[PDB]
Design an enzyme around this catalytic site. Structure first.
Site, PDB file in Angstrom:
ATOM      1  N   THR A  18       0.813  -1.216   0.000  1.00  0.00           N
ATOM      2  CA  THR A  18       0.000   0.000   0.000  1.00  0.00           C
ATOM      3  C   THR A  18       0.840   1.257   0.000  1.00  0.00           C
ATOM      4  OG1 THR A  18      -0.114   0.108   2.421  1.00  0.00           O
ATOM      5  CG2 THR A  18      -1.851  -1.101   1.275  1.00  0.00           C
ATOM      6  N   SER A  19       0.277   2.346  -0.510  1.00  0.00           N
ATOM      7  CA  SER A  19       0.963   3.622  -0.451  1.00  0.00           C
ATOM      8  C   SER A  19       1.018   4.124   0.987  1.00  0.00           C
ATOM      9  CB  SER A  19       0.285   4.636  -1.364  1.00  0.00           C
ATOM     10  OG  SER A  19       0.422   4.230  -2.712  1.00  0.00           O
TER      11      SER A  19
ATOM     12  N   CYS B 179       7.818  -1.318   9.671  1.00  0.00           N
ATOM     13  CA  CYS B 179       7.393  -2.384  10.572  1.00  0.00           C
ATOM     14  C   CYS B 179       8.495  -3.407  10.800  1.00  0.00           C
ATOM     15  CB  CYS B 179       6.149  -3.089  10.044  1.00  0.00           C
ATOM     16  SG  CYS B 179       4.698  -2.026  10.068  1.00  0.00           S
TER      17      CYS B 179
ATOM     18  N   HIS C 141       7.863   0.399   4.068  1.00  0.00           N
ATOM     19  CA  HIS C 141       7.402  -0.845   4.637  1.00  0.00           C
ATOM     20  C   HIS C 141       8.597  -1.664   5.101  1.00  0.00           C
ATOM     21  CE1 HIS C 141       3.170  -0.417   3.803  1.00  0.00           C
ATOM     22  NE2 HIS C 141       3.423  -0.123   2.542  1.00  0.00           N
ATOM     23  N   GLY C 142       8.355  -2.584   6.022  1.00  0.00           N
ATOM     24  CA  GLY C 142       9.416  -3.459   6.469  1.00  0.00           C
ATOM     25  C   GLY C 142       8.910  -4.678   7.194  1.00  0.00           C
TER      26      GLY C 142
END
Ligand code: NA
Ligand code: NA
EC number: 3.4.22.56
Lengths: 4, 240, 240, 4
Positions: free
Chosen positions: C34-35, C135, C93-94
């Protein structure tokens, strides 16, 4: 010297 | 009264708190784990060091995985209301996320979880310090020549070594990390905030120790400890 | 001259150093990621904050995994001799040990390795700071109502969240962690050592933020950042 | 509020  | 500030943990409760030292030297034969020569030097140094900081020290030796879990569970169910803090020192074999009982591994997360903000209410808001001398993998450092709070808040894990790396222990002198930690607490606990003490420990381990081995693979290696802080205030072992 | 002390990093080189900000907002459709609404607020706040600390800021947007690796490699091969420090901020993100390029993951260890003491010699002995908003897993915090040096030495990883946990970002205000980090640097960088600034960030995130969601699974959750320090000296952004 |  030794490692754990 | 006048202006007040709230940047440091309250450390003037009637008791500083417990210091639990788990010293695993001898392992069950079936595990194939070697005896950890030098670890009694560590355990003795820690006992004296935390005694002088006015912790109630409890030394435990050669605990099984079941005994470790039972001990942590029981301690987490004590009334810590009159205690400022909690300290647990783990001396053993390990891998990433794991420390070994004498007969098999225990998850570090499982140990820490007993002391979560929601599971140990008499330690909520108080610093919970886990000091770990154990390997975190098998990498070697070659060196270079020069309303609510989170349930995971107020934990500190002071690791002897970087993630993924072996940790070094001398059979005569004790572990590099615990040697250094005790020396820096002795010298600076009446002077410096705990993160700054641990930073001095990082420097001492990083600069003053280098492995000596007849095995080229293990010779001339270095170590850097790793501070993992989820603390929300400054921590001073002294007060007033 | 008189007595001298050596407990803090030398931060009076001609330049403070680079601050690389990697801002990944939009991801390739095939990844299904997701953006990250709100991340431009973070990137702008960081740019201004580190500008005022006299860092040479370079903002990068929407980098592929290949571009991230190439950027880190190229930056690590610059001459940092006249720079006091190095800062890298990753917004993406992660998962645990991972941050995402727009088309796939990059190992955090791979990124950090370019700046190892033996691989980036003009940063040896200088602080290398990695600030990560991403994350680290999918856990939610329910809260509770109240000669040589090591090649891995002199790194600090300032993580937005505890190992294993999601990290929270507000689509209007930016991420909890970066919001808080910038506010605390603005207020305390001329006053406090960096670990003490980051401890204030821990407290701010832990106490002032709580998630609001129409989804019960994600509602009323909390966050604690995690400082991972392998620094060997105190770090002050000011000098003299 | 969204997660990363
Ligand atoms: Na050690
Ligand atoms: Na955050």
């Amino acid at each position: 010297d030794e490692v754990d | 009264s006048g202006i007040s500030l709230d940047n440091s943990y309250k450390m003037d409760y009637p008791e500083m708190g417990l210091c639990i030292i788990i010293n695993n030297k001898n392992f069950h034969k079936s595990t194939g784990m070697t005896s950890r020569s030098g670890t009694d030097v560590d355990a003795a140094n820690l006992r004296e060091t935390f005694r002088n900081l006015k912790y109630e020290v409890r030394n435990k030796n050669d605990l099984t995985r079941e005994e470790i879990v039972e001990l942590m569970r029981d301690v987490s169910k004590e009334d810590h209301s009159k205690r400022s803090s909690f300290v647990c020192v783990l001396l053993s074999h390990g891998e990433e996320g794991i420390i070994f009982g004498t007969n098999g591994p225990v998850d570090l997360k499982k140990i820490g979880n007993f002391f979560r903000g929601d599971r140990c209410r008499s330690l909520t808001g108080k610093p919970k310090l886990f000091i770990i001398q154990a390997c975190r993998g098998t990498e070697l450092d070659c060196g270079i020549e020069t309303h609510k709070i989170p349930v995971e808040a107020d934990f500190l894990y002071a690791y002897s070594t970087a993630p993924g790396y072996y940790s070094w222990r001398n059979s005569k002198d004790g572990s590099w990390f615990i040697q250094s930690l005790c020396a820096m607490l002795k010298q600076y606990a009446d002077k410096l905030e705990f993160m700054h003490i641990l930073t001095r420990v990082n420097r001492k381990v990083a600069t003053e120790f280098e492995s000596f081995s007849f095995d080229a693979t293990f010779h001339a290696k270095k170590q850097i400890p790793c501070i993992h802080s989820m603390l929300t205030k400054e921590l001073y072992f002294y007060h007033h």
